[PDB]
Structure formats: structure tokens, C-alpha cells
Amino acid sequence: AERGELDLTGAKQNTGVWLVKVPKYLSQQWAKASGRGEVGKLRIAKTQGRTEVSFTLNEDLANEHPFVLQSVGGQTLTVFTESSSDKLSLEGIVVQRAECRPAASENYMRLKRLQIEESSKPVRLSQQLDKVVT
Amino acid sequence: FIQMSVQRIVEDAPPIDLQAPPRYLLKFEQIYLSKPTHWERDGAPSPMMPNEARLRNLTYSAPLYVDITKTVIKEGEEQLQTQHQKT
Amino acid sequence: NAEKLVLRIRIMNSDENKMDDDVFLRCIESNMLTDMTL
Amino acid sequence: GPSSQNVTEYVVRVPKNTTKKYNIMAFNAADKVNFATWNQARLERDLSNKPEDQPWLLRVNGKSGRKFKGIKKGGVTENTSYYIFTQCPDGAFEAFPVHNWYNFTPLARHRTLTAEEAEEEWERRNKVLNHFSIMQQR
Amino acid sequence: GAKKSAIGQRIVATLPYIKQEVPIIIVFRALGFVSDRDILEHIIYDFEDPEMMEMVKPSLDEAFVIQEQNVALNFIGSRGAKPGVTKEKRIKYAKEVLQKEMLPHVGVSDFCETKKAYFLGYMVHRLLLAALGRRELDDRDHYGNKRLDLAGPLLAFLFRGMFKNLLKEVRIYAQKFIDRGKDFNLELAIKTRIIS
Amino acid sequence: VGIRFCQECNNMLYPKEDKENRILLYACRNCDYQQEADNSCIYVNKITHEVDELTQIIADVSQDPTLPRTEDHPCQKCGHKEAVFFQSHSARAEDAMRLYYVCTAPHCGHRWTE
Amino acid sequence: PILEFLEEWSMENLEEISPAAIADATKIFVNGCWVGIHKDPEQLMNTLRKLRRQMDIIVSEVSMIRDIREREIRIYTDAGRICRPLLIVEKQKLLLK
Numbered sequence: 001a002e003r004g005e006l007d008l009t010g011a012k013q014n015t016g017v018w019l020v021k022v023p024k025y026l027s028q029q030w031a032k033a034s035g036r037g038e039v040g041k042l043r044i045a046k047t048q049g050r051t052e053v054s055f056t057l058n059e060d061l062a063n064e065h066p067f068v069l070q071s072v073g074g075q076t077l078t079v080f081t082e083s084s085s086d087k088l089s090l091e092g093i094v095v096q097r098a099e100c101r102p103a104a105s106e107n108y109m110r111l112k113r114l115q116i117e118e119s120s121k122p123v124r125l126s127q128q129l130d131k132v133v134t
Numbered sequence: 135f136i137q138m139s140v141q142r143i144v145e146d147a148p149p150i151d152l153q154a155p156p157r158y159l160l161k162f163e164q165i166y167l168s169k170p171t172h173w174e175r176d177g178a179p180s181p182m183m184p185n186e187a188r189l190r191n192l193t194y195s196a197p198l199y200v201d202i203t204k205t206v207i208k209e210g211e212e213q214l215q216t217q218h219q220k221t
Numbered sequence: 222n223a224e225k226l227v228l229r230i231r232i233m234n235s236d237e238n239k240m241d242d243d244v245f246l247r248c249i250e251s252n253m254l255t256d257m258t259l
Numbered sequence: 260g261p262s263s264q265n266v267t268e269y270v271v272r273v274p275k276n277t278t279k280k281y282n283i284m285a286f287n288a289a290d291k292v293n294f295a296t297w298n299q300a301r302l303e304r305d306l307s308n309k310p311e312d313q314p315w316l317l318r319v320n321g322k323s324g325r326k327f328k329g330i331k332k333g334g335v336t337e338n339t340s341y342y343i344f345t346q347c348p349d350g351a352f353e354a355f356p357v358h359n360w361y362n363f364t365p366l367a368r369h370r371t372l373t374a375e376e377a378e379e380e381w382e383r384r385n386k387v388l389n390h391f392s393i394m395q396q397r
Numbered sequence: 398g399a400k401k402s403a404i405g406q407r408i409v410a411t412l413p414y415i416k417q418e419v420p421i422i423i424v425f426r427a428l429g430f431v432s433d434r435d436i437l438e439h440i441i442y443d444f445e446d447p448e449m450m451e452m453v454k455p456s457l458d459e460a461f462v463i464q465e466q467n468v469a470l471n472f473i474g475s476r477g478a479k480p481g482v483t484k485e486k487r488i489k490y491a492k493e494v495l496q497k498e499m500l501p502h503v504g505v506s507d508f509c510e511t512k513k514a515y516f517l518g519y520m521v522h523r524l525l526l527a528a529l530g531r532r533e534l535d536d537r538d539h540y541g542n543k544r545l546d547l548a549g550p551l552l553a554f555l556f557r558g559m560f561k562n563l564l565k566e567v568r569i570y571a572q573k574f575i576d577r578g579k580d581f582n583l584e585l586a587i588k589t590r591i592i593s
Numbered sequence: 594v595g596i597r598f599c600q601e602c603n604n605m606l607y608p609k610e611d612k613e614n615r616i617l618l619y620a621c622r623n624c625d626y627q628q629e630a631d632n633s634c635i636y637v638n639k640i641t642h643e644v645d646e647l648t649q650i651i652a653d654v655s656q657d658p659t660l661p662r663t664e665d666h667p668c669q670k671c672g673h674k675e676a677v678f679f680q681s682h683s684a685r686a687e688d689a690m691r692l693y694y695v696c697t698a699p700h701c702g703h704r705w706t707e
Numbered sequence: 708p709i710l711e712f713l714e715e716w717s718m719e720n721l722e723e724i725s726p727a728a729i730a731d732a733t734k735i736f737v738n739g740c741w742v743g744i745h746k747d748p749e750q751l752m753n754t755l756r757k758l759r760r761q762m763d764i765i766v767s768e769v770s771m772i773r774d775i776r777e778r779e780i781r782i783y784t785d786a787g788r789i790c791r792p793l794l795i796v797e798k799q800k801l802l803l804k
């Protein structure tokens with residue numbers, strides 16, 4: 001027991017967690033309020049020999065997000081956290097990886113184009129000057 | 135080159151840091167170009183037409199200006215930031 | 222008569238009875254492939 | 260049975276702030292990392308540079324156990340974010356953004372040749388004999 | 398040679414700002430990949446290919462002595478165009494060389510070593526395929542391997558050299574006045590004839 | 594042919610002989626670690642190297658629009674009439690004129706040579 | 708814009724993958740930088756081609772090259788590339804009507 005000791009209790013319990021890759025707009029909407037304690041519901045549907053994961057955006061947040069799972073046997077992932085009181089702990093071990101994709105295809109690029117244009121605002125360009133500086 | 139490369143080159147240049155102990159910084163941000171101008175003997179600027187450059191053996195050149203922000207620190211918990219627009 | 226022609230090679234018995242017993246074969250194998258003339 | 264058609268849906272919560280930050284720890288598959296023997300471990304910043312902008316050093320079971328070094332992922336997730344779902348008694352998923360991504364690899368422990376010693380071997384680097392013997396002499 | 402032809406053909410790297418080339422595996426050691434499996438994973442993506450594995454054996458033996466990242470960095474620093482006075486400074490110089498001078502297009506950030514190892518391994522992987530005859534050698538005459546420097550890029554090449562002189566000139570002008578104790582005039586510090 | 598890596602430091606394992614037992618052992622360097630060799634062959638090189646090109650051929654080539662396609666060589670695995678044929682055109686062969694066929698049916702990357 | 712779109716689609720970053728996955732996947736190069744790997748090269752090229760032809764995210768002068776044999780997709784955006792306009796043909800028919 002010391003300051004640098006790692007609380008490996010989470011590893012002992014073999015707690016499982018899911019790693020999800022999501023776009024910025026979904027997180028940006030969450031970052032808008034980020035304090036209401038609710039951003040949506042995660043729905044998982046399973047069949048006899050197939051499983052599908054999808055996420056629905058909150059109606060208030062807006063004012064379909066299908067999920068695709070990925071193999072995790074090629075790399076072993078673990079999640080750990082550092083406490084502000086200098087007490088590191090291991091939350092658990094990743095058991096599945098998922099990715100989020102946009103339901104729309106055509107108009108979705110329009111939102112991306114705005115982001116690319118928005119990120120282009122700091123891109124300064126030379127300005128033509130009508131009158132020579134005196 | 136004029137619209138992007140010149141501005142990127144100026145932006146990508148590292149700020150000039152100088153220490154005496156007063157400290158001086160120079161940061162170049164915005165690049166301006168005027169239309170090709172020719173200065174007469176009296177010093178009066180005038181637009182330079184390409185034919186006049188050809189006839190009078192002039193160089194068809196446009197003045198280049200850069201906005202320079204200078205910040206000086208004199209270890210006296212005061213910072214003075216003066217900007218020279220269109221240098 | 223055999224469809225495959227073979228030639229087994231081993232180091233002298235006197236030396237067996239200094240460089241390396243394994244690497245030396247590679248040096249011989251590379252040396253015999255090119256330097257040796259049939 | 261129910262498992263053949265079970266459907267599960269849980270609420271998602273995004274707390275504004277957490278006392279402890281969340282970052283991903285990645286181990287290569289070939290490492291065969293096992294936590295059963297991880298009785299004790301130590302994680303601290305490196306001292307080679309001699310803080311928040313330096314690599315992380317991981318030690319397991321003191322000097323006896325394996326030592327791993329973590330390096331921050333150079334590629335930034337400007338257009339991407341990572342979230343982790345953790346089971347809770349209330350039954351609602353909780354997502355925490357990934358503050359950092361770290362890649363850890365094992366560090367071998369043994370009498371590694373020193374910089375001064377390597378100088379002598381550089382003479383025989385082109386022509387060396389019995390690669391096994393070089394370590395025995397050291 | 399006796400042992401020269403036994404190991405086979407070894408791969409070296411000619412990094413910028415180094416007088417003499419270094420073994421390829423050493424560069425991987427400097428980048429932070431010590432174990433052979435970790436290095437080979439960035440070079441050979443299919444371990445089931447015995448042909449590729451043999452091609453890297455001589456390279457591994459050449460850099461067998463160097464077994465630590467700091468040892469490898471010192472070796473790279475020792476051969477630098479400006480050898481360090483002490484061992485510690487040599488490592489710092491080698492780190493800077495790989496950080497910025499080596500494969501800069503991959504990255505220049507302090508945490509881009511992994512990306513540079515993959516691309517460097519890809520360079521080795523591409524070399525092995527050419528050596529193994531699996532991929533045809535690149536054609537210099539092939540015109541998709543060519544680029545045309547038009548007026549813009551040509552002018553941009555001049556501007557940075559001329560802008561660096563401008564920034565150097567103002568540094569020199571300001572340093573004289575700052576050392577003298579008096580502030581300097583920015584307008585007077587700029588030499589307009591440098592760019593014009 | 595098999596390449597073995599140490600289980601301690603993940604370094605190369607090189608062949609070694611133990612005079613006590615006279616059995617090939619793959620011993621790690623700078624790791625005082627040893628393993629029981631089983632292949633019994635430490636080195637092999639094929640000068641002729643009659644390596645099959647079909648193993649090298651990638652089934653994805655069937656999607657190449659620049660390759661010729663023939664209906665006269667149906668796929669054996671699935672019977673698809675269409676096939677994409679090409680030459681190895683790889684160095685070290687010295688004679689590259691025979692055609693290798695790849696089935697164009699999706700999900701059937703069958704490769705064969707006549 | 709190319710890198711942002713590639714990350715959004717099913718392209719795995721080099722840092723976040725194990726080397727064992729690189730064998731089957733196709734390397735993705737953007738301006739000579741190995742950005743990542745992708746498991747469905749054919750679909751990606753169709754998507755990349757579609758965007759360029761619609762001029763949505765990919766400008767006209769961006770060249771996407773897939774080396775099917777080498778399992779590599781090379782995307783080039785830099786200057787100095789010489790190109791010419793060619794009529795697009797689909798299903799043995801000109802899209803020009």
C-alpha cells in the first residue's frame with residue numbers, strides 16, 4: 001500500500017466494459033448540456049443466430065445510430081483511472097469494441113461540410129488591398 | 135501561392151523571441167497584398183499597368199504587408215502588447 | 222536411380238573428436254555454392 | 260429460451276465531471292499479459308527526461324515482475340471520441356470520454372550491454388563468433 | 398567472406414544528418430521497439446512467410462549487441478554530424494534527429510514514434526519484396542512518380558528562404574538594440590529589400 | 594523453417610546443441626532461456642525455389658477491370674463461367690507466360706492454373 | 708477532409724490496431740502517409756469515387772489509387788500531379804448523354 005500502488009480490484013472481479021467509437025457531433029450534442037444526466041438509450045436486439053446493436057438520439061438532444069461490433073481477440077485492452085487524490089485504480093477489462101455510423105448518407109455529408117468549413121475559419125488567407133498602405 | 139502559401143509561410147514561421155531582463159516577442163499573423171503600384175520620383179503611388187511596366191522597364195510587383203504583434207515583458211508583472219497593422 | 226540426387230556432408234571426425242559446429246556449415250554452404258567450381 | 264430472443268435496453272448517463280479521469284490501457288496480444296500474478300504494481304512518470312507531458316512507466320511486482328512503458332498515442336482524435344460502458348447496479352450505462360490512450364509493451368530485464376560495452380563489440384560487429392558466447396563473457 | 402556470406406544480406410538506413418549509415422534494426426531500437434518480435438511485427442505482417450523472415454536475420458544479428466533504446470539512441474547520436482560531448486547529449490541529439498529529421502512527413506510530434514516505426518517497417522517491407530522479387534522495382538521514368546513544380550510552389554520555395562532571412566535580420570537588428578538597453582523600432586528592423 | 598521467438602523477452606531463438614543429451618535446442622540469446630526443438634531442420638534454402646504462385650495470388654484481383662476475363666475456363670469450386678486470367682510477371686521465374694485464373698464470383702476466390 | 712472522412716468510415720488507425728490485422732487488410736495512404744488499414748477496400752473505393760464525382764468532400768484533383776495486388780489504397784492530394792479529364796463509363800455506357 002503506497003501512493004504508486006494500483007488498485008487492481010477491478011481486474012480481480014473480471015468486470016467487462018465496451019469500447020465505442022462515436023463521431024464528434026453526437027458527443028458535441030452531449031457536451032452542449034453535459035449535465036442533465038441523460039443523452040439517449042442504448043438498445044440491443046438479439047436473434048437466434050444474430051445480434052444487432054443500435055442507439056437512438058434523445059428527442060430533446062436533437063432539437064438512428066446503428067452500432068457495429070469488432071473483434072477484440074487481436075488486442076487486449078484494459079481501462080484504468082487516476083484519482084485526483086493520487087489513487088490509481090483499474091475500472092475493468094474491455095470485452096467488446098463497437099463503432100457508430102450515420103443512418104443518413106446524402107444529407108449527412110452536408111453536416112460534415114459545415115464542420116470542414118467551420119474548421120476552416122482559423123485558416124487565414126492573404127487579403128487583396130484596394131489602396132496601397134500609406 | 136499568393137492566397138495560401140505566402141500566408142502559411144508567415145504563419146508557420148516561429149515567433150521571434152529575444153531576451154535582454156526585458157523579453158520581446160514578435161508574431162506575424164495576417165498578410166495583405168495591394169495592387170501592383172509604382173512610386174514616382176516625388177513618391178506618389180499609382181497603379182502600375184502591365185504595359186507601363188513593359189515600356190518603362192519596371193517590375194510588375196505588388197506591395198506585401200504583414201500584421202505584426204509585439205509583446206514586451208519587463209519582469210514587472212506588466213505586459214504591453216502593441217500591434218503594427220500592415221507592416 | 223532415386224528420383225532425387227542427394228549428397229550428405231559432415232565435418233571431419235578429428236575436429237569433432239573451434240569456430241562453431243553450426244555456423245561453420247552455413248559458411249561452407251555459402252562458400253561451396255559459389256566459390257567452389259565443379 | 261429467453262436468451263434466444265432476449266432484448267436489453269439501458270439508459271445512458273454522461274456526468275458533467277468526474278474526480279478520476281479515464282484513459283485506455285492497451286496491451287499487445289503477443290504479450291500474453293496475465294493479471295493473476297499482478298499482486299502489486301507501480302505506475303509513475305519516467306525520470307529519463309530529468310511531468311504531465313512525459314511518458315508513463317509501469318512496474319509490476321516491484322523489480323522482480325515485468326516492467327511496462329506506456330506512451331501517449333500521437334494521433335489525436337480530433338474527429339473521433341471514445342467511450343466506455345460500465346455496468347452499474349442502477350442498470351443504466353455510463354459513458355466516460357477517453358482522456359488519453361496509452362500503449363504498453365513489456366520491457367525485458369537482464370544484463371543488457373551498456374553503451375561503453377557496445378563500443379568494443381562494434382569492432383567485431385561485422386565479424387563476430389558464437390553469438391551465444393558474447394553474453395556469457397559479459 | 399567466411400561469415401560475411403553466412404548471415405546473408407543485411408539492411409542499413411541512411412538517416413539525415415548522420416555521416417554514416419546505421420543498421421536498420423538499430424533505428425527500430427531507437428524508436429522504442431526493443432524485442433525482435435515487436436520490430437519484426439512492423440516489417441513482416443505475415444509470420445507464416447518463411448522467405449521474408451530469413452531476409453531480416455542478418456539485420457537482427459548486426460544489431461544484436463544493441464538491446465536497449467537508450468543504447469541504440471547513443472549509437473545513432475555517436476554517428477551524428479555533430480557528435481555530442483557526453484553520452485547524455487548524444488542521446489538527446491539522436492532523439493531530435495529521429496523526432497524531426499527522420500520521416501518528417503509521418504510526423505514531428507513527440508509521440509509519433511509508433512507511426513514512424515510502421516512506415517519505416519513498410520520501407521523495409523517494400524525493400525524485402527523487391528529483394529524477394531515479389532514486387533517490381535519502381536520506374537523513375539514512370540510519370541506518376543513525378544511532380545511538376547509550377548510558379549506557385551517554385552515561388553513558395555524562394556519565399557521561405559527569403560522570409561527566414563527577414564526574420565533572421567530583425568532578430569539581429571533587435572539584438573543589437575536590446576543589448577544596448579534601448580527598445581527597437583519594428584519598422585526599422587525590417588529589411589524590405591530581402592523579399593523584393 | 595519455423596521461426597521461434599523467446600517467451601520471456603520475445604527475442605529470436607537460435608538453434609543450439611546440448612552435448613549432454615545431443616538434442617537440438619532453440620536457445621534465446623541474452624536470456625539464458627532454452628526450448629525443445631522439434632522440426633530438426635535449422636536452415637533450408639531452395640535455389641530453384643519452385644514456389645507456387647497460386648499461394649501468392651490474391652483473390653481480390655478478380656475486381657481489377659484492367660485484367661482480361663474469359664468465359665471458357667469455368668471455376669471448379671463453384672462452376673462460375675467467368676474467370677480473370679493473368680501472368681505472374683514476377684522476377685526470379687525467368688519464364689513468365691503461363692496464365693493463372695481467378696474465379697470472378699464474389700466470395701469465391703478460387704485460383705487455378707491450367 | 709479526406710482524413711476526417713476516412714476516420715469516420717471503417718478505417719482503423721495504425722496506433723489502435725494489432726500488427727496481426729495488417730495482413731488481410733489494405734493499407735490506406737494519404738499523401739504518402741500510412742493513415743490506417745481498411746477491411747473492405749472495394750466498398751471504400753466505390754465510396755471515395757462517389758464523393759469525388761459528387762464533389763462533396765473530395766475535390767476533383769484528388770487522385771485515389773487502389774493497388775489490388777499489393778493491398779494498398781493510395782490517396783494523393785498534393786500539388787504537381789498531372790491529370791487529364793476522362794469520360795466516365797459505367798456498364799459499358801457513357802454517363803455523358
Ligand SMILES: [Zn+2]
Nearest residue numbers: 599602621624
Ligand atoms: Zn529471451
Ligand SMILES: [Zn+2]
Nearest residue numbers: 668671696701
Ligand atoms: Zn468460383
